[PDB]
């Protein structure tokens with residue numbers, strides 16, 4: 001029972017159904033193995049281990065997987081890409097992510113931090129050892145993290161360096177907030193998201209208080225993004241194959257901390273997309289017929305702190321996103337691959 005930090009090629013596992021035509025099920029059918037039937041972790045009594053969620057190769061390996069999955073499934077009619085115009089089919093596919101597990105080969109094990117207040121960086125006291133991670137839904141989105149896990153007690157603030165304003169902050173919520181997005185049946189690209197306002201604003205209240213704990217009680221100010229290409233300025237996600245862009249100004253600007261009802265965010269289903277996998281534009285086909293609906297859980301927030309506010313008494317935070325590696329980070333944060341012996 002000796003180990004050291006190391007990186008190896010992992011393998012993936014999932015409860016995919018071989019009959020299902022959903023693209024995540026197909027990709028996991030040919031690319032992952034069945035999940036462990038009898039998994040079990042080994043408690044490491046009075047062992048303290050150092051983790052770093054911002055420098056973890058697991059994240060890059062999952063990222064490479066999700067790039068491959070999307071490359072094979074969600075494929076665009078036209079892909080303007082650094083001067084090329086690769087054209088191809090874009091059949092309306094079935095899209096709904098399933099949990100994926102990340103497993104070590106023989107000779108390696110993953111270490112899992114069970115400290116219920118772990119912030120992703122430095123020491124962990126209650127350390128367990130596993131062979132596979134839990135099932136992680138690979139939900140691509142900006143500004144808001146959806147379908148995710150929740151912090152087990154206090155709202156957790158994750159960052160590689162909180163005093164460096166350039167490094168993204170991940171708010172890990174301890175209570176989810178439902179966001180219910182609909183494109184009603186047949187402007188066929190107009191859509192909207194509904195969110196409970198009292199819930200959302202109570203949770204933003206709590207986030208404010210946490211950030212106060214992290215910033216010497218400086219005043220905390222929320223604002224929408226300041227410049228961006230649309231995938232950043234708007235909450236962008238995929239609903240049954242369609243790319244939704246949603247204005248979140250009503251979430252990051254009324255402050256509202258007589259306002260307490262149901263927030264309705266306007267949204268558009270875009271066709272031309274700035275891809276998150278790599279630089280380039282992808283053009284898909286117009287939306288499917290019928291009502292397109294997704295009821296997701298908001299479980300985390302991607303935030304960028306404003307710079308140059310050192311000599312002021314405020315700290316400004318704006319929703320961020322773009323690098324999906326942080327999206328996988330928000331779930332992989334408690335894991336670490338150690339080579340055995």
Ligand SMILES: CN1CCN(C(=O)N2C[C@H](CO)C[C@H](C(=O)Nc3ccc(Cl)c(F)c3)C2)CC1
Pocket residue numbers: 140141142229230231232236237238243273274275276277278279280321322323324
């Ligand atoms: C570092 N690496 C280089 C290439 N890259 C980009 O260039 N961008 C820039 C682009 C606009 O500027 C926005 C991109 C983005 O997040 N797109 C996106 C597409 C679909 C969905 Cl559903 C979504 F949630 C997000 C990020 C990724 C990061």
Ligand SMILES: *[C@@H]1O[C@H](CO)[C@@H](O)[C@H](O)[C@H]1NC(C)=O
Pocket residue numbers: 043114126128
């Ligand atoms: C450590 O985490 C494990 C995982 O659930 C569990 O035994 C318990 O929460 C913790 N154990 C102790 C002794 O605190």
Ligand SMILES: *[C@@H]1O[C@H](CO)[C@@H](O)[C@H](O)[C@H]1NC(C)=O
Pocket residue numbers: 147148175176297
């Ligand atoms: C949303 O959150 C609720 C309560 O936090 C949970 O029971 C439910 O499973 C979550 N939904 C999804 C799709 O994870």
Ligand SMILES: *[C@@H]1O[C@H](CO)[C@@H](O)[C@H](O)[C@H]1NC(C)=O
Pocket residue numbers: 153154155174175206207209210
């Ligand atoms: C969430 O964490 C906050 C601390 O930021 C705490 O005050 C609150 O009671 C927690 N709520 C839930 C539902 O866990």
Ligand SMILES: *[C@@H]1O[C@H](CO)[C@@H](O)[C@H](O)[C@H]1NC(C)=O
Pocket residue numbers: 119120121122123157158159160161162
């Ligand atoms: C994370 O926790 C460690 C140890 O408690 C601490 O050194 C580090 O500053 C923390 N980071 C954040 C962003 O709270």
Ligand SMILES: *[C@@H]1O[C@H](CO)[C@@H](O)[C@H](O)[C@H]1NC(C)=O
Pocket residue numbers: 161163164165
């Ligand atoms: C965090 O950011 C500040 C500001 O840029 C920098 O001075 C400091 O060295 C950073 N921390 C580390 C550990 O590099």
Ligand SMILES: *[C@@H]1O[C@H](CO)[C@@H](O)[C@H](O)[C@H]1NC(C)=O
Pocket residue numbers: 180181182194295
């Ligand atoms: C979501 O929104 C639609 C349209 O407003 C509504 O019919 C539905 O009841 C809402 N809730 C759920 C869980 O779908």
Ligand SMILES: *[C@@H]1O[C@H](CO)[C@@H](O)[C@H](O)[C@H]1NC(C)=O
Pocket residue numbers: 196197198199202261262
């Ligand atoms: C919103 O959730 C809050 C709980 O904080 C509750 O008071 C209310 O029932 C919900 N509002 C609606 C319109 O469902």
Ligand SMILES: *[C@@H]1O[C@H](CO)[C@@H](O)[C@H](O)[C@H]1NC(C)=O
Pocket residue numbers: 213215216217
């Ligand atoms: C922040 O303000 C609270 C007031 O409730 C105080 O107890 C706490 O010491 C303050 N912390 C810092 C770091 O200023």
Ligand SMILES: *[C@@H]1O[C@H](CO)[C@@H](O)[C@H](O)[C@H]1NC(C)=O
Pocket residue numbers: 233234247248249
């Ligand atoms: C979001 O809506 C507000 C008005 O409610 C508008 O001022 C803002 O420009 C919109 N955001 C974008 C990115 O268009």
Ligand SMILES: *[C@@H]1O[C@H](CO)[C@@H](O)[C@H](O)[C@H]1NC(C)=O
Pocket residue numbers: 224249253254
């Ligand atoms: C919200 O901030 C935006 C700046 O992007 C601006 O459109 C608006 O004035 C602010 N909110 C209100 C209620 O004015």
Ligand SMILES: *[C@@H]1O[C@H](CO)[C@@H](O)[C@H](O)[C@H]1NC(C)=O
Pocket residue numbers: 096097139146147237238239294295296297
């Ligand atoms: C969140 O989970 C629900 C329940 O499976 C799902 O219907 C929804 O599409 C998910 N959200 C996203 C953005 O995938």
Ligand SMILES: *[C@@H]1O[C@H](CO)[C@@H](O)[C@H](O)[C@H]1NC(C)=O
Pocket residue numbers: 163308310
């Ligand atoms: C702002 O303050 C942080 C830490 O106090 C420092 O690292 C950073 O360089 C400062 N930025 C400027 C522009 O002075």
